[PDB]
PDB file of all heavy atoms in Angstrom:
ATOM      1  N   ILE A  22     -46.711 -18.156-109.856  1.00 26.71           N
ATOM      2  CA  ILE A  22     -45.791 -19.268-109.679  1.00 26.71           C
ATOM      3  C   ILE A  22     -45.054 -19.549-110.984  1.00 26.71           C
ATOM      4  O   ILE A  22     -43.835 -19.667-110.995  1.00 26.71           O
ATOM      5  CB  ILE A  22     -46.548 -20.526-109.210  1.00 26.71           C
ATOM      6  CG1 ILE A  22     -47.060 -20.298-107.788  1.00 26.71           C
ATOM      7  CG2 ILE A  22     -45.650 -21.750-109.280  1.00 26.71           C
ATOM      8  CD1 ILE A  22     -47.797 -21.486-107.209  1.00 26.71           C
ATOM      9  N   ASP A  23     -45.785 -19.611-112.092  1.00 30.24           N
ATOM     10  CA  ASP A  23     -45.165 -19.883-113.388  1.00 30.24           C
ATOM     11  C   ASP A  23     -44.194 -18.769-113.810  1.00 30.24           C
ATOM     12  O   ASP A  23     -43.121 -19.044-114.323  1.00 30.24           O
ATOM     13  CB  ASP A  23     -46.262 -20.144-114.438  1.00 30.24           C
ATOM     14  CG  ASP A  23     -47.019 -21.451-114.175  1.00 30.24           C
ATOM     15  OD1 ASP A  23     -46.407 -22.475-113.798  1.00 30.24           O
ATOM     16  OD2 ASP A  23     -48.255 -21.459-114.341  1.00 30.24           O
ATOM     17  N   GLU A  24     -44.529 -17.514-113.558  1.00 30.81           N
ATOM     18  CA  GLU A  24     -43.599 -16.451-113.913  1.00 30.81           C
ATOM     19  C   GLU A  24     -42.329 -16.669-113.130  1.00 30.81           C
ATOM     20  O   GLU A  24     -41.235 -16.656-113.675  1.00 30.81           O
ATOM     21  CB  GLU A  24     -44.164 -15.081-113.550  1.00 30.81           C
ATOM     22  CG  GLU A  24     -45.405 -14.760-114.344  1.00 30.81           C
ATOM     23  CD  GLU A  24     -45.919 -13.364-114.081  1.00 30.81           C
ATOM     24  OE1 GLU A  24     -46.194 -13.011-112.901  1.00 30.81           O
ATOM     25  OE2 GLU A  24     -46.050 -12.622-115.073  1.00 30.81           O
ATOM     26  N   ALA A  25     -42.494 -16.886-111.831  1.00 29.09           N
ATOM     27  CA  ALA A  25     -41.354 -17.103-110.956  1.00 29.09           C
ATOM     28  C   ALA A  25     -40.527 -18.308-111.414  1.00 29.09           C
ATOM     29  O   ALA A  25     -39.302 -18.240-111.507  1.00 29.09           O
ATOM     30  CB  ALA A  25     -41.841 -17.316-109.505  1.00 29.09           C
ATOM     31  N   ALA A  26     -41.204 -19.418-111.694  1.00 26.62           N
ATOM     32  CA  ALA A  26     -40.510 -20.626-112.119  1.00 26.62           C
ATOM     33  C   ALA A  26     -39.628 -20.407-113.362  1.00 26.62           C
ATOM     34  O   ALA A  26     -38.556 -21.014-113.484  1.00 26.62           O
ATOM     35  CB  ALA A  26     -41.524 -21.746-112.353  1.00 26.62           C
ATOM     36  N   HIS A  27     -40.049 -19.525-114.267  1.00 26.77           N
ATOM     37  CA  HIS A  27     -39.248 -19.271-115.461  1.00 26.77           C
ATOM     38  C   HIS A  27     -38.114 -18.321-115.159  1.00 26.77           C
ATOM     39  O   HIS A  27     -37.042 -18.434-115.731  1.00 26.77           O
ATOM     40  CB  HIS A  27     -40.091 -18.674-116.586  1.00 26.77           C
ATOM     41  CG  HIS A  27     -40.902 -19.683-117.334  1.00 26.77           C
ATOM     42  ND1 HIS A  27     -42.225 -19.942-117.033  1.00 26.77           N
ATOM     43  CD2 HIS A  27     -40.600 -20.455-118.403  1.00 26.77           C
ATOM     44  CE1 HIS A  27     -42.702 -20.825-117.892  1.00 26.77           C
ATOM     45  NE2 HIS A  27     -41.737 -21.151-118.733  1.00 26.77           N
ATOM     46  N   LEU A  28     -38.344 -17.387-114.253  1.00 29.15           N
ATOM     47  CA  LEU A  28     -37.329 -16.409-113.923  1.00 29.15           C
ATOM     48  C   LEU A  28     -36.197 -16.979-113.089  1.00 29.15           C
ATOM     49  O   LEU A  28     -35.075 -16.470-113.138  1.00 29.15           O
ATOM     50  CB  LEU A  28     -37.964 -15.223-113.189  1.00 29.15           C
ATOM     51  CG  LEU A  28     -37.366 -13.815-113.369  1.00 29.15           C
ATOM     52  CD1 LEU A  28     -37.937 -12.912-112.296  1.00 29.15           C
ATOM     53  CD2 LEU A  28     -35.850 -13.809-113.280  1.00 29.15           C
ATOM     54  N   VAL A  29     -36.453 -18.052-112.344  1.00 27.80           N
ATOM     55  CA  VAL A  29     -35.386 -18.578-111.484  1.00 27.80           C
ATOM     56  C   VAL A  29     -34.107 -18.991-112.156  1.00 27.80           C
ATOM     57  O   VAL A  29     -33.045 -18.921-111.546  1.00 27.80           O
ATOM     58  CB  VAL A  29     -35.837 -19.763-110.625  1.00 27.80           C
ATOM     59  CG1 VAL A  29     -36.818 -19.304-109.557  1.00 27.80           C
ATOM     60  CG2 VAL A  29     -36.424 -20.863-111.495  1.00 27.80           C
ATOM     61  N   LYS A  30     -34.184 -19.421-113.406  1.00 28.22           N
ATOM     62  CA  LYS A  30     -32.974 -19.836-114.100  1.00 28.22           C
ATOM     63  C   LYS A  30     -32.036 -18.641-114.279  1.00 28.22           C
ATOM     64  O   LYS A  30     -30.826 -18.803-114.358  1.00 28.22           O
ATOM     65  CB  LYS A  30     -33.326 -20.498-115.441  1.00 28.22           C
ATOM     66  CG  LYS A  30     -34.815 -20.629-115.757  1.00 28.22           C
ATOM     67  CD  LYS A  30     -35.525 -21.551-114.787  1.00 28.22           C
ATOM     68  CE  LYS A  30     -35.539 -22.982-115.307  1.00 28.22           C
ATOM     69  NZ  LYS A  30     -34.181 -23.572-115.349  1.00 28.22           N
ATOM     70  N   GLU A  31     -32.616 -17.448-114.351  1.00 28.83           N
ATOM     71  CA  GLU A  31     -31.816 -16.247-114.525  1.00 28.83           C
ATOM     72  C   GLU A  31     -31.317 -15.636-113.239  1.00 28.83           C
ATOM     73  O   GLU A  31     -30.447 -14.774-113.263  1.00 28.83           O
ATOM     74  CB  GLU A  31     -32.603 -15.205-115.297  1.00 28.83           C
ATOM     75  CG  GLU A  31     -32.859 -15.648-116.703  1.00 28.83           C
ATOM     76  CD  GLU A  31     -33.011 -14.481-117.620  1.00 28.83           C
ATOM     77  OE1 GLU A  31     -32.040 -13.690-117.733  1.00 28.83           O
ATOM     78  OE2 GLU A  31     -34.098 -14.350-118.220  1.00 28.83           O
ATOM     79  N   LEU A  32     -31.862 -16.074-112.112  1.00 30.59           N
ATOM     80  CA  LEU A  32     -31.419 -15.526-110.838  1.00 30.59           C
ATOM     81  C   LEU A  32     -30.431 -16.466-110.168  1.00 30.59           C
ATOM     82  O   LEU A  32     -30.071 -16.298-108.995  1.00 30.59           O
ATOM     83  CB  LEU A  32     -32.627 -15.276-109.948  1.00 30.59           C
ATOM     84  CG  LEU A  32     -33.636 -14.314-110.600  1.00 30.59           C
ATOM     85  CD1 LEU A  32     -34.824 -14.113-109.657  1.00 30.59           C
ATOM     86  CD2 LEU A  32     -32.958 -12.954-110.919  1.00 30.59           C
ATOM     87  N   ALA A  33     -29.975 -17.447-110.932  1.00 30.17           N
ATOM     88  CA  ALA A  33     -29.025 -18.431-110.428  1.00 30.17           C
ATOM     89  C   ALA A  33     -27.715 -18.400-111.208  1.00 30.17           C
ATOM     90  O   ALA A  33     -27.506 -19.217-112.097  1.00 30.17           O
ATOM     91  CB  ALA A  33     -29.634 -19.824-110.508  1.00 30.17           C
ATOM     92  N   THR A  34     -26.823 -17.481-110.861  1.00 28.01           N
ATOM     93  CA  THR A  34     -25.550 -17.379-111.557  1.00 28.01           C
ATOM     94  C   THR A  34     -24.328 -17.833-110.777  1.00 28.01           C
ATOM     95  O   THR A  34     -23.210 -17.681-111.260  1.00 28.01           O
ATOM     96  CB  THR A  34     -25.311 -15.955-112.011  1.00 28.01           C
ATOM     97  OG1 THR A  34     -25.584 -15.067-110.919  1.00 28.01           O
ATOM     98  CG2 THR A  34     -26.213 -15.622-113.198  1.00 28.01           C
ATOM     99  N   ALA A  35     -24.521 -18.381-109.577  1.00 30.17           N
ATOM    100  CA  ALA A  35     -23.387 -18.852-108.771  1.00 30.17           C
ATOM    101  C   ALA A  35     -22.750 -19.975-109.547  1.00 30.17           C
ATOM    102  O   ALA A  35     -23.364 -20.495-110.476  1.00 30.17           O
ATOM    103  CB  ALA A  35     -23.857 -19.363-107.427  1.00 30.17           C
ATOM    104  N   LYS A  36     -21.542 -20.382-109.160  1.00 33.26           N
ATOM    105  CA  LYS A  36     -20.843 -21.436-109.889  1.00 33.26           C
ATOM    106  C   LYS A  36     -21.169 -22.875-109.528  1.00 33.26           C
ATOM    107  O   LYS A  36     -20.282 -23.707-109.356  1.00 33.26           O
ATOM    108  CB  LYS A  36     -19.333 -21.218-109.794  1.00 33.26           C
ATOM    109  CG  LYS A  36     -18.877 -19.846-110.337  1.00 33.26           C
ATOM    110  CD  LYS A  36     -17.367 -19.693-110.221  1.00 33.26           C
ATOM    111  CE  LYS A  36     -16.957 -18.235-110.315  1.00 33.26           C
ATOM    112  NZ  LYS A  36     -15.505 -18.077-110.007  1.00 33.26           N
ATOM    113  N   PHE A  37     -22.431 -23.157-109.415  1.00 36.18           N
ATOM    114  CA  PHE A  37     -22.916 -24.508-109.130  1.00 36.18           C
ATOM    115  C   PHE A  37     -24.400 -24.476-109.393  1.00 36.18           C
ATOM    116  O   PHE A  37     -24.996 -23.415-109.571  1.00 36.18           O
ATOM    117  CB  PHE A  37     -22.504 -24.941-107.724  1.00 36.18           C
ATOM    118  CG  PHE A  37     -23.254 -24.252-106.627  1.00 36.18           C
ATOM    119  CD1 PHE A  37     -24.395 -24.786-106.029  1.00 36.18           C
ATOM    120  CD2 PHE A  37     -22.780 -23.028-106.190  1.00 36.18           C
ATOM    121  CE1 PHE A  37     -25.037 -24.103-105.016  1.00 36.18           C
ATOM    122  CE2 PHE A  37     -23.423 -22.345-105.176  1.00 36.18           C
ATOM    123  CZ  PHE A  37     -24.552 -22.883-104.590  1.00 36.18           C
ATOM    124  N   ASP A  38     -25.024 -25.640-109.428  1.00 31.80           N
ATOM    125  CA  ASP A  38     -26.439 -25.681-109.696  1.00 31.80           C
ATOM    126  C   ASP A  38     -27.152 -25.399-108.379  1.00 31.80           C
ATOM    127  O   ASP A  38     -27.296 -26.270-107.519  1.00 31.80           O
ATOM    128  CB  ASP A  38     -26.807 -27.050-110.272  1.00 31.80           C
ATOM    129  CG  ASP A  38     -28.238 -27.120-110.732  1.00 31.80           C
ATOM    130  OD1 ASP A  38     -28.888 -26.052-110.806  1.00 31.80           O
ATOM    131  OD2 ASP A  38     -28.713 -28.248-111.024  1.00 31.80           O
ATOM    132  N   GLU A  39     -27.581 -24.154-108.230  1.00 30.59           N
ATOM    133  CA  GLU A  39     -28.257 -23.724-107.024  1.00 30.59           C
ATOM    134  C   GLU A  39     -29.590 -24.392-106.723  1.00 30.59           C
ATOM    135  O   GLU A  39     -30.288 -24.894-107.618  1.00 30.59           O
ATOM    136  CB  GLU A  39     -28.468 -22.217-107.085  1.00 30.59           C
ATOM    137  CG  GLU A  39     -27.181 -21.449-107.121  1.00 30.59           C
ATOM    138  CD  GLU A  39     -27.415 -19.977-107.390  1.00 30.59           C
ATOM    139  OE1 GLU A  39     -28.161 -19.345-106.617  1.00 30.59           O
ATOM    140  OE2 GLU A  39     -26.864 -19.451-108.373  1.00 30.59           O
ATOM    141  N   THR A  40     -29.955 -24.371-105.445  1.00 31.67           N
ATOM    142  CA  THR A  40     -31.231 -24.932-105.026  1.00 31.67           C
ATOM    143  C   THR A  40     -32.287 -23.820-105.074  1.00 31.67           C
ATOM    144  O   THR A  40     -31.996 -22.680-104.770  1.00 31.67           O
ATOM    145  CB  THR A  40     -31.114 -25.477-103.613  1.00 31.67           C
ATOM    146  OG1 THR A  40     -30.248 -26.619-103.637  1.00 31.67           O
ATOM    147  CG2 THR A  40     -32.483 -25.884-103.058  1.00 31.67           C
ATOM    148  N   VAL A  41     -33.497 -24.152-105.511  1.00 32.51           N
ATOM    149  CA  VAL A  41     -34.591 -23.188-105.548  1.00 32.51           C
ATOM    150  C   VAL A  41     -35.285 -23.361-104.192  1.00 32.51           C
ATOM    151  O   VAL A  41     -35.465 -24.499-103.711  1.00 32.51           O
ATOM    152  CB  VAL A  41     -35.565 -23.507-106.709  1.00 32.51           C
ATOM    153  CG1 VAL A  41     -36.768 -22.588-106.670  1.00 32.51           C
ATOM    154  CG2 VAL A  41     -34.815 -23.372-108.057  1.00 32.51           C
ATOM    155  N   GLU A  42     -35.630 -22.232-103.565  1.00 30.82           N
ATOM    156  CA  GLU A  42     -36.248 -22.214-102.246  1.00 30.82           C
ATOM    157  C   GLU A  42     -37.557 -21.462-102.243  1.00 30.82           C
ATOM    158  O   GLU A  42     -37.771 -20.532-103.060  1.00 30.82           O
ATOM    159  CB  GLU A  42     -35.338 -21.494-101.241  1.00 30.82           C
ATOM    160  CG  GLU A  42     -33.851 -21.900-101.268  1.00 30.82           C
ATOM    161  CD  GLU A  42     -32.979 -20.830-100.676  1.00 30.82           C
ATOM    162  OE1 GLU A  42     -33.536 -19.891-100.064  1.00 30.82           O
ATOM    163  OE2 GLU A  42     -31.741 -20.902-100.810  1.00 30.82           O
ATOM    164  N   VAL A  43     -38.409 -21.839-101.299  1.00 33.13           N
ATOM    165  CA  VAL A  43     -39.687 -21.172-101.084  1.00 33.13           C
ATOM    166  C   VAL A  43     -39.729 -20.738 -99.619  1.00 33.13           C
ATOM    167  O   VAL A  43     -39.409 -21.529 -98.717  1.00 33.13           O
ATOM    168  CB  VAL A  43     -40.889 -22.110-101.368  1.00 33.13           C
ATOM    169  CG1 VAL A  43     -42.186 -21.436-100.937  1.00 33.13           C
ATOM    170  CG2 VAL A  43     -40.929 -22.471-102.857  1.00 33.13           C
ATOM    171  N   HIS A  44     -40.102 -19.486 -99.369  1.00 32.86           N
ATOM    172  CA  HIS A  44     -40.187 -18.986 -97.989  1.00 32.86           C
ATOM    173  C   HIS A  44     -41.557 -18.401 -97.752  1.00 32.86           C
ATOM    174  O   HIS A  44     -42.127 -17.761 -98.639  1.00 32.86           O
ATOM    175  CB  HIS A  44     -39.165 -17.884 -97.737  1.00 32.86           C
ATOM    176  CG  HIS A  44     -37.754 -18.300 -97.960  1.00 32.86           C
ATOM    177  ND1 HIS A  44     -36.893 -18.582 -96.924  1.00 32.86           N
ATOM    178  CD2 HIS A  44     -37.051 -18.493 -99.100  1.00 32.86           C
ATOM    179  CE1 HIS A  44     -35.720 -18.935 -97.416  1.00 32.86           C
ATOM    180  NE2 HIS A  44     -35.788 -18.887 -98.736  1.00 32.86           N
ATOM    181  N   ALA A  45     -42.079 -18.568 -96.545  1.00 30.00           N
ATOM    182  CA  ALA A  45     -43.394 -18.027 -96.265  1.00 30.00           C
ATOM    183  C   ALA A  45     -43.502 -17.517 -94.855  1.00 30.00           C
ATOM    184  O   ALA A  45     -42.987 -18.144 -93.931  1.00 30.00           O
ATOM    185  CB  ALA A  45     -44.456 -19.085 -96.506  1.00 30.00           C
ATOM    186  N   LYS A  46     -44.148 -16.366 -94.688  1.00 35.15           N
ATOM    187  CA  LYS A  46     -44.375 -15.847 -93.356  1.00 35.15           C
ATOM    188  C   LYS A  46     -45.761 -16.392 -93.035  1.00 35.15           C
ATOM    189  O   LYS A  46     -46.696 -16.195 -93.812  1.00 35.15           O
ATOM    190  CB  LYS A  46     -44.374 -14.327 -93.357  1.00 35.15           C
ATOM    191  CG  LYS A  46     -44.827 -13.728 -92.026  1.00 35.15           C
ATOM    192  CD  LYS A  46     -43.924 -14.141 -90.881  1.00 35.15           C
ATOM    193  CE  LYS A  46     -44.226 -13.293 -89.620  1.00 35.15           C
ATOM    194  NZ  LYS A  46     -43.443 -13.722 -88.417  1.00 35.15           N
TER     195      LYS A  46
END
């Protein structure tokens, strides 16, 4: 979770402050 939480800032390059989502099967 912590690795993911730090990486999300880098996977958000759209021109607005993107929403972080969680998906689960």
Side-chain angles (χ1 to χ4, degrees):
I22 292 181
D23 292 320
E24 296 185 304
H27 281 96
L28 212 194
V29 291
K30 358 295 268 67
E31 294 207 61
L32 302 180
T34 47
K36 302 180 198 172
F37 72 94
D38 187 11
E39 297 171 57
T40 292
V41 175
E42 313 158 11
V43 172
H44 301 257
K46 171 61 168 175

